[PDB]
Chain length 195, copies 6
């Protein structure tokens, strides 16, 4: 398993404090040789922002990869025609992002990265994480699972008694999922037992 020479986009959705489960996977991809471009859902700074106010997570991304963080539509768009990715990852993918992605809405820098990658016939790999995955998001998920060029990090119910509709990916399986996606395949078993 070797991503030398590969340009992988890594988009993060949802609350900043849930990224401790995926940043170690971003770090593994860089260690396996990938050039990793981070994508995020909002601007990382306002005119207003002061010296050491930036949350830890941004600093952590900057310690993993020197690729500029894509945090605007303008910055995301060239990943279609100019600087194409070999693969785009979205992890964690929240319920809101899942239903936007599944319904062809593309109103965040992350979803624009995904759209720009799909434009070229290249793979998008998603790590779901939502408590409505077996409820209102079920059709969205299964729509994506069946769609050309879209692949899922293996997933399962994380707490069936307390959150019976919740599905969450095994983030440790991310590199393997990318490796199979780059060959045009869904990595298997896609359904796993979480913890």
């Amino acid at each position: 398993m070797n991503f030398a020479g590969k340009h992988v986009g890594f988009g993060l959705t949802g609350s900043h404090c849930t990224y401790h489960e995926v940043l170690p996977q971003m770090e593994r991809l860089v260690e396996l040789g990938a050039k990793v471009t981070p994508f995020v859902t909002h601007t990382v700074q306002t005119t207003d922002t002061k010296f050491g106010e930036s949350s830890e997570w941004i600093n952590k991304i900057k310690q993993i990869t020197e690729e500029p963080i894509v945090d605007s539509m303008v910055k995301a768009e060239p990943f279609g025609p100019k600087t194409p990715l070999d693969c785009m990852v979205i992890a964690p993918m929240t319920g809101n992002s899942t239903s936007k992605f599944a319904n062809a809405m593309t109103d965040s820098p992350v979803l624009m990265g995904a759209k720009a990658t799909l434009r070229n016939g290249k793979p998008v790999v998603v790590g779901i994480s939502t408590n409505d995955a077996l409820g209102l998001n079920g059709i969205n998920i299964m729509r994506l699972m069946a769609t050309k060029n879209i692949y899922f990090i293996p997933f399962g119910q994380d707490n069936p008694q307390v959150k019976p509709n919740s599905l969450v990916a095994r983030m440790e399986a991310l590199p393997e999922t990318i490796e199979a996606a780059l060959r045009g395949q869904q990595y298997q078993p896609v359904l796993i037992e979480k913890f």
Copy 2:
């Protein structure tokens, strides 16, 4: 009919000046003993906002219930794991909110309240109010009507000659709809003749 001990969330969507049809129903729930938490789609104040600039509707909510208005994602999220509602109401539910809700988008404090309530298997009760309900919103509405744990305040065409696609709930039926939802039932007749 008695809601003593019950924690009901009451989310408002759409223009602030359409809430005169639902605030009297919020007031009835409090009078019937419910603890009512209001949810709204945007922040109720900016840094900028001055003394008596706040619109009447906010003041009116504050006269009905002392529960803090949930006007942010941060404030809405604990209604899943920490402070669960027995029922969430969304009334009025606009066409835009209807199609976001039906498609699993959860990008407002109101929709997060609904998602957090559905996470726990608890009921959400909606009062539709849109002029495209029998047009592009029809599938969204019927999707929701058939979905586990989602119930509709009885509704009908409010002006068939002038707005032939428009459906609006009879807001006076809200408490009865909550009472049936808390038993796992859709209150009937769900189709009524408006005015």
Copy 3:
């Protein structure tokens, strides 16, 4: 209201013994001057069939109109290119027929009549009658209601306490629905109170 010169197809779906609610409407159309062609879902005779074995309903159709009953795909198909209808009615339209029609299946003579009429941009008017209309059929119904050239005989819940998902058309409104459909309009109010 005058259908002189108009060629209206009248398809019947579901059990033969439910047609007592629509045959009087077929008779009114003929009395208002329409040329009415009946369409049915299966062959009206097998090689096997004997003299007075044919059910009353067939005889009743034959007393209303002398147009040959279209009971096969071969017989239905020319209503596209050769003998086009000005309007096709499907009443009663069962839940099974509703979900086939809504999903573009066309495997009965009735649905082929509808397809052949839609091919030409001409109206199809449906009278629903199913106990799952507000359940699994809801999306199918609302899909059809929003689709070009498809119109609904006004309908409502026929027994909300006992069959809460059931919607049935007011068959007496059929001619009026045809009249509005021929002008490109849905007759209003489309939602009525049944009995």
Copy 4:
């Protein structure tokens, strides 16, 4: 766990030789006290049929339960208004039956049993078994999983390397799934590891 006094319908879909995985579960329900009515997708005899020609599976059903096999639309229909079930099971539910059920088609005695049970607000429990469950059937499955009164026998991928889209229920979990469905609940974990 006790089904004394309960009338459970048990519909079988697909090839006759796949019923060896569900007949032992039909037998457990009878042993736990249920009155079990079998439903099947076609007529069990033609005029033509001879003495010992009937396949073993029919004989096996007849050894488990003395309730007449419902093998026609006429026989299935009274399970709505006259002889209502407390629960309807469909197991195995093939891909074809899954997509008919999910799309509101009701053109077999089994699907009519399910429709007649849903008419009354009563539960239907399904055991999927199709090699396209994570492909074209994915949306159908997730639609059903989210729909009022429909519940799934826990399921999983039965051979991810060879049939990566295949999901099959753990049929041994059927009684437990019925028990939770009768209380209005999906039995959990709904996602399991097959064999």
Copy 5:
């Protein structure tokens, strides 16, 4: 072809620098006699904005038509009950706008113009322009194409080898598409060969 007396709304979605393909068509409508109201997706000025900072495109709209630019929900809403359009155009319609429109979301001034026009039974004409039109947006597009009162400027693949999912309208066909829409018809051929 003459639009004298006609009030046509012209909404623009997506990047400001893609409007050079549609402004000449806005200009033709005014030259053919239409009163053209522009609709845009965001506010055209902030408190902050300075003298000659406004992008060329705004100035260009202002040279074509003196109707105030509708750039807010408040400004768009009266096009339902007070100042109804005879037709609303959305061109270019981006992938994001397409999937919002198709899913009944109405959270921009442009989509509110479209909703307000559909409320009245009046036509909306769309010019698609997205690189995912034959991918994730395909169902949205075909949903709209089949929906009452919605019509498409003829379109085709603009670069099948490089962007195989991309569909873009022939903007030169816009007036003809409006003319047919005003008669209740889709202008044909709707599928063309781009450049």
Copy 6:
């Protein structure tokens, strides 16, 4: 372009007399070296059938290929686990077959061949031919176009003035479409101008 060693299934749907447009393409595949198995939607003989009663089309298939015609579910099923195809073609694919296929119904030998091929991750290539393709079938078509392992023989409107919703494949492009499908690609341009 060489199909030596390749096992291609060729399913025919719709009226027997429309196969003159695809049998020459079946013949080209055999001439290019493919082993071609025909699939059809019904049994090719009844007990009843007499000597020279069989329609010309059957004889014509038998002159092109000696592979037994798969005309039953029993015969189609082994193309999953025992005798897998490298590709399955469905041409012509009627509107009825399109909406069954798109909705995961698998109730004909042709659709079972397609299901059995998709089970293995292998390509299915479809040639649409229906007068409702841009109407009620639009979502079905676009669903299939976006689905893993499904590819379309290039298609277009065959008579936009007379049948404005009609799409039909250019059957001459079938081999090229198979060649690209076997590499995991949709052959381009997929949208063409018919005749």
